[PDB]
Amino acid sequence: HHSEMTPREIVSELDKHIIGQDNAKRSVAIALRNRWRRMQLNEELRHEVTPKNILMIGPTGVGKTEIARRLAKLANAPFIKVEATKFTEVGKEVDSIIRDLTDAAVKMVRVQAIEKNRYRAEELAEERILDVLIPPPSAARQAFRKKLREGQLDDKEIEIKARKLKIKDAMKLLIEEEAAKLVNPEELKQDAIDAVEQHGIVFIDEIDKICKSGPDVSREGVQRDLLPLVEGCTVSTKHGMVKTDHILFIASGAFQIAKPSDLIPELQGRLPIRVELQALTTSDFERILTEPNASITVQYKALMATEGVNIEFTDSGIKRIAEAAWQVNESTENIGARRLHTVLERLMEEISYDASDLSGQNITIDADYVSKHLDALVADEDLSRFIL
Amino acid sequence: HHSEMTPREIVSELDKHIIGQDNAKRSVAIALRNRWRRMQLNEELRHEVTPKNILMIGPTGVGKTEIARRLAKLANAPFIKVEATKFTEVGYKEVDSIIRDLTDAAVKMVRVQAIEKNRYRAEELAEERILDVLIPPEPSAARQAFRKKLREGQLDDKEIEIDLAAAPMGVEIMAPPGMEEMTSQLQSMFQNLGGQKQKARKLKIKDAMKLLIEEEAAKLVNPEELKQDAIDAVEQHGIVFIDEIDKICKSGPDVSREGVQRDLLPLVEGCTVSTKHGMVKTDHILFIASGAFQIAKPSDLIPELQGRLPIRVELQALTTSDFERILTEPNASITVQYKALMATEGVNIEFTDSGIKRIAEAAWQVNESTENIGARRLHTVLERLMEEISYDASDLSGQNITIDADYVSKHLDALVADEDLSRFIL
Amino acid sequence: HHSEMTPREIVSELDKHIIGQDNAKRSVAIALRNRWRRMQLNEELRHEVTPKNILMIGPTGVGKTEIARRLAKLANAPFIKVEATKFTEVKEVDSIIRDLTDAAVKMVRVQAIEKNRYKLLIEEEAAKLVNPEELKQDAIDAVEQHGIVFIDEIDKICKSGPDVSREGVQRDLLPLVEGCTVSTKHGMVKTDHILFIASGAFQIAKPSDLIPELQGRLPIRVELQALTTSDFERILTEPNASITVQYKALMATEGVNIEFTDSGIKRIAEAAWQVNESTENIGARRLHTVLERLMEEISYDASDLSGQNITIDADYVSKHLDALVADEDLSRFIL
Amino acid sequence: HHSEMTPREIVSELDKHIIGQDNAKRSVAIALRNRWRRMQLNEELRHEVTPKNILMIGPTGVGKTEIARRLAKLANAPFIKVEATKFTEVGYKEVDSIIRDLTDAAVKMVRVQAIEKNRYRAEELAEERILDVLIPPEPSAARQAFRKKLREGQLDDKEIEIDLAAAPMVEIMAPPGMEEMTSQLQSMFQNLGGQKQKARKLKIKDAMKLLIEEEAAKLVNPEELKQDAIDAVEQHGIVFIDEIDKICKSGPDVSREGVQRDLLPLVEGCTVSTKHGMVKTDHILFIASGAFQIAKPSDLIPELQGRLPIRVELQALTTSDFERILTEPNASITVQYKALMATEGVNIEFTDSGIKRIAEAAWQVNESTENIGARRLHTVLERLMEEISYDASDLSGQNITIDADYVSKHLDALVADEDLSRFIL
Ligand SMILES: Nc1ncnc2c1ncn2[C@@H]1O[C@H](COP(=O)(O)OP(=O)(O)O)[C@@H](O)[C@H]1O
Ligand SMILES: Nc1ncnc2c1ncn2[C@@H]1O[C@H](COP(=O)(O)OP(=O)(O)O)[C@@H](O)[C@H]1O
Ligand SMILES: Nc1ncnc2c1ncn2[C@@H]1O[C@H](COP(=O)(O)OP(=O)(O)O)[C@@H](O)[C@H]1O
Ligand SMILES: Nc1ncnc2c1ncn2[C@@H]1O[C@H](COP(=O)(O)OP(=O)(O)O)[C@@H](O)[C@H]1O
């Protein structure tokens, strides 16, 4: 059901992925904790209590989206990201948010079912093999069970319409037959509805652009159409009837042009929690390259390891990589932490291409190797917009 | 099924939720009371007498919508709130959708009332079928043993194989956004025709119990009697609330603005609207409209609409004395909810009289310093005030936290004093 | 089948609801009587003879719509009212016949449920012998032969930029009056024999500003006089189930006997006449808002006033009204 | 089939309905005569020869549409009238809809022709199933006895229980564009539910007519009836496009000429899909009309001018023509008002001097304000007859004579005032 984690355990889990932005983490943790707190109340208070929506404020590239993505992934919750300006053009309907979110939940519950159906099909597949070895666990059945998993015993011929086969090729055929009987289409579609209603999470990006003569009537019309979603309503979908009352909504935006006070008063009352996010620094970039679990540099260490090349990133090399991304954002356009992705690939493109010929070597990326493939490019701002 | 409550008993019940706004409570009581007065007349007068619709006037956040919500909830009536500007575009949402979503809201209303009557019986037969798998076949011993262990025990995590019904079709249809409602109706037809059977599958008693209650409760209630009864709820008891009707009043946009009034005209004057649950007649449906009317006036409405809104009430703006009452008096007020939410973690929150008073002063000052959003400022102010407690409530378990006037001025006055920061955070 | 009533019998029944406007009652009586006259002709003349459509002219709130509603209710005919300006935006015009069919399906369905009730074995034969598709077929026969359509504010689509879009509504409405075949979910519907009644103020434009093809499809023209103070008094009392009789019976449910004096009925009408002259003239609709504001105190206290006789005089009217009617700024919001 | 009448026999028949406009009648007579002329040619010349489409020019109300209506009714051809401005919005209407409604008019036309032939076979099979209920089962005696008693006798008032078909089935919500589709889906569930007949008690009087309808559907093949209507549209189809002058030619000109480009594949010929099957528009005859006061036929796109070879100007009607329209045409408005008042028992008689002043009154209104053509005769007559039509119930058994004095009493007062003539007349 809903996870029992405390807000401190949720923020501690988010620190494995997002760097900094502790205030934003505490806001989503409190909202996720209220999901469990509402389950502990009586029947009257469960309907009266609605989720507390979060309005994030900050420049682009500070992690507003990754916090929401990891939260839904931490809460095992369906997630969708919608641009607020998509509805500005008009006839797309605003209800499409719930329609596409539901579709994401239907595929989610299917993959989670196949994951739980595989271990169940394999247990019953080898269980039917043990009936041929020892006709009816006692001893011999437990002996052939441990010898079938650990050993290469599968090469022996075993007759399992009865037909003779090899346990290696009979095991994969018995998994196909057992996995087809473990799926319930009715309970799968109903759980996808409960996933959207109870656990649903919706992230509305760049909601500041729809704030307030000609365009303002079109802008404030999106909020009036977004209003029944946050206040709760019924949306018809192909999969069934989806109620948005218990869905959590997380909005974000720059708010340089407008302010959250420019939103309609009915929407402000539906976005009670507000959190400002600080912009990232050069000291933060050095942290993002290494600290987060499966960071882009750790991934590249493992990717070249597939070819047999050991990549090592020195601190002086990581420092100039971070200094490179900061310089490009200042010289041209500030895209946030996304600059680290394009800068890392441009430096690593020569190693990634020749990695097949570098098998068996240890390549050390220092401050000098970084400045050779970068400083020439970072010096030209005209080249920095196309290449970086 | 019309409630016999007098106008004074209705206003007294509304006082349990809404604070003040006595004129608007007396308006909705008259409309609801006429529902019972009409049912006592002869056949000729029942059709000639039509509900008296209400046009509410007042600034935002004064409780216009909540009065309509509690009115329909008090009368056990289907209710829907629609924004008048939703139909300004006109290219598809249809104006008929107001009765459509009102019909579907009534079907769920009469369904939950049918589930509660069938609940204890469906749960009795659901667990009865579980006992047939545990002990294959007066109850003797083992059956009464597993029955008591199933209700009291957490043994539902065990694996049990029970036969259950399933729809073998499993077909998905691609549809453009307009056909999203229609294709779902086609999917229910193919499952209703061919498949009648039950297939043996392996489940867990925790998930198998909830799946058995749905199957047994469906057999107890008849769909033909329930679907036609919901239509009788929309025609007699239906209640519709049209928000921000002042924004559709009156060259370029005014033709599209007044077009919404023309489209809403057959609803209030009465007409026949087709729904998937049946044919619905809007003649006796009660309509309530609300608006600020700062830009326009009720005279700027089309003359055909003015006659269909005979009852007029303006609602007064809330004051600081009202904010102090809203924080406590109403049932399930925002402080009552937060008090119970922190109690989940084991923390006892207490709000002093002077603390509640300085919370209201903060919300009042923000509405004046920046933008007046009405009583909705109380949530943003309270959530900002309690965000430290709500995060630490896990570690504060077993402690009594008292919110005094000093605690309020510490976490708020700093923010309210700076107007530039007040707009972002509050 | 279809009831045969002389034009005087139609007007005499309309007098039980509408007050005055005798010129419009005589026009609608001719059209409904032609429904029975065409049934008595031969096969060749039935298709050649087309219904005579009516174009009504007059200010708002004079009873143009009530005359049409009571006419169809008297003939048990499907009725629909659509605003001509709804098609100014570039909804299809065929939706007029679609919503007319939907309203006729429920009409013949509710009327058929009563016939089946006229005890458990009789109801089991009612759910069997009655066919759901046969009711759909009976509705289509009611739309083609007896159908009545009312098009409000038709003068607003008269005639350079918007005039091409305004007159385009007339051109799209043309096949409906000339006759055509419109497809609906309930079946195929033919508009040849449907009666159409149009109305408008015609202060901005004139019927001559309509396209020439449309003028010939509206042979009957009638102007409705503006209601006066003497007419307002008659609307409060004379019509069957009048707004005052309704409010007299609603209070009677609580146990209170309400009586309206002749002096009060006169000043109630004078109050409504004063508001239409001071701010905006909404016609007889002003009586609805004025009555409710006068009776709002009695309607709320009717539970505690049970067993009492409350008499509404001219003094009680002047107490709850003259204060509000004198202030025009408040008259727009409250009245 | 294809009528063999000569151009002179066509025009002579059109004079029974339309008055004057001889140059236009000769144009439509040539186009209908070429339908028969092409039939007598060889296989190569039949396809190469295409119908000669007609463009009518003249003021409104001169009878352009009545010539097209009476022409198709004379040739027993499917006919449809469409306004050229209907497709200006082009939202969803597709121009292909002209052939769609034309096919539906042909299906109903050939269906009634199939009902008359199936009447004797259905009535034989309808009473055949009734005889199985009376005498349970060459005919021997009892079957031949009840057969002669059912046709000759009024014995149908007896209660007889016969089995008849019905379906248990549902409503579907759809946007206005799917209104035609959902009607087809509903018919498919009624056919799929089951094939059988439910037993119910009835009367032979009402059971015989209900048995004829069920048998008549089985006798006619839905593939033969549906495909025969396609042959009626391709060869005999006649389409009238009104006010084509309003789609002639910057901002509106792109949307106006866009209608001609969408109308172009219809006149040049193409394949249009209908619910009844595939229809080819190559040989369908098209007739266009317009006032052409604002624009000219040369303003049309060059590809459309080549597809409208026949050009005819229609003259404006005069006072002498209005006198003829009130009397000469079959089922004229004055004869129709004579029979309508006859239903109440009143005999109406129009004098020659009264008819003459009516025509002069209709001309004066067209001259004083706006000229709407012969349509003015409808409003002028109804205003004159409105007092008689209301009292027709109490005037039963009386003979009312409409003279020149009765015309000037109810009209000249109203016609003299031009401000009131616009509203009332
Ligand atoms: N605090 C952070 N820690 C780690 N990665 C981050 C952080 N902030 C941004 N990123 C990077 O930015 C990308 C996504 O940024 P996103 O959250 O979509 O920007 P925004 O906050 O403007 O929505 C991710 O690929 C991630 O690597
Ligand atoms: N008089 C009142 N008494 C209690 N709560 C109120 C009152 N007025 C407003 N509220 C609060 O404001 C919210 C309702 O605002 P709403 O009525 O929707 O705004 P509006 O009246 O502008 O439509 C509710 O959450 C309610 O708690
Ligand atoms: N002559 C009349 N007699 C009785 N009621 C009238 C009369 N004229 C107007 N009304 C009132 O006006 C309302 C309907 O007006 P309506 O006919 O819609 O206006 P319009 O004539 O502008 O269409 C009804 O509620 C009716 O009580
Ligand atoms: N020459 C005519 N003979 C008889 N009736 C006519 C004649 N011209 C017009 N009408 C009358 O006018 C109407 C037809 O006008 P129509 O042909 O549609 O106008 P247009 O010729 O401008 O398209 C019919 O009702 C018909 O009675």
Residue numbers in the entry:
A (entry chain F): 0 to 90, 94 to 138, 152 to 175, 212 to 263, 268 to 443
B (entry chain E): 0 to 91, 94 to 138, 151 to 263, 268 to 443
C (entry chain D): 0 to 89, 94 to 121, 223 to 263, 268 to 443
D (entry chain C): 0 to 91, 94 to 138, 151 to 182, 184 to 263, 268 to 443
How do the authors describe this structure?
ATP-dependent proteolysis requires HslU6 to bind the degrons of target proteins in its axial channel and then unfold and translocate the substrate into the proteolytic chamber of HslV12. To reach the axial channel of the HslU hexamer, substrates must transit a funnel-like structure formed by segments of its intermediate (I) domain. Here, we present evidence for a model in which HslU hexamers are autoinhibited at low temperatures by a trimeric I-domain plug that blocks the axial channel but melts at high temperatures to activate proteolysis.
We determined structures for three new crystal forms of E. coli HslU or HslUV by molecular replacement. We could not reliably model connections between plug elements and other regions of the I-domain in specific subunits. The three α helices that comprise the plug center packed together via hydrophobic contacts involving the side chains of Met192, Met195, Leu199, and Phe203. Additional hydrophobic packing contacts within the plug included Val184 and Ile186 from the extended region, which occupy peripheral grooves between plug helices, and Met202 from the helix. A Pro189-Pro190-Gly191 tripeptide formed a sharp turn between the extended region and α helix of the plug. The negatively charged side chains of Glu193 and Glu194 following this turn were also close to the positively charged side chains of Arg101 (94% conserved) and Lys293 (92% conserved) in the HslU axial channel, suggesting that favorable electrostatic interactions also stabilize the plugged conformation. Because protein substrates must access the axial channel of HslU to be engaged, unfolded, and translocated into the peptidase chamber of HslV, this plug would inhibit substrate degradation. Hence, replacing the nonpolar Leu199 with a polar Gln199 in the L199QHslU variant should destabilize helix-helix packing and plug stability, thereby reducing autoinhibition and providing a structural rationale for the ability of L199QHslUV to degrade some protein substrates more rapidly than wild-type HslUV.
